[PDB]
Amino acid sequence: AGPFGPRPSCPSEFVSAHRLSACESWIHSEATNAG
Amino acid sequence: PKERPPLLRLCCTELHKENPECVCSTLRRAAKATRVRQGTAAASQVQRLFQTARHLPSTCGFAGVGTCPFKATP
Ligand SMILES: [Cl-]
Ligand SMILES: [Cl-]
Ligand SMILES: [Cl-]
Ligand code: NA
Ligand code: NA
Ligand code: NA
Prior knowledge:
The complex is a heterodimer of chains A (35) and B (74). The longest helix of chain A has 11 residues, at 21-31. Chain A is built from two helices and no strands. Chain A is elongated. Chain A has helices at 10-16, 21-31. With 35 residues, chain A is an all-alpha fold. Chain B is mainly alpha-helical and 74 residues long. Chain B has one domain: Hydrophobic Seed Protein. In chain B, 61% of the residues lie in helices and 0% in strands. Chain B contains three helices and no strands. Chain B is globular and about 30 Å long. At the A-B interface, α1 and α2 of A face α1, α2 and α3 of B. The structure holds chloride ion (CL) (3 copies) and sodium ion (3 copies).
């Protein structure tokens, strides 16, 4: 770990990945299949 | 078909935009967002929602991650 390491910023990656919008739709589709 | 559903493949592409050590935290955030936006309250649906999210790295070839650990559901 150092000042110039990769230093991932998870919230920024989340917004850059469209808030995982396709995963959100997939999760929703699976959830309503319960039982 | 042996290929996965297109929507699942789109999800995997989005997950690949993140570092492995961010995936589980962001999937928890995604699950909470869907749960709240869609007003999912039936117990079995809520459990399946969060379980599906925790298994996505293993549904998506993220070998370093595996299945995300269980965290109590809000
Ligand atoms: Cl985040
Ligand atoms: Cl959604
Ligand atoms: Cl994949
Ligand atoms: Na399925
Ligand atoms: Na959010
Ligand atoms: Na219930």
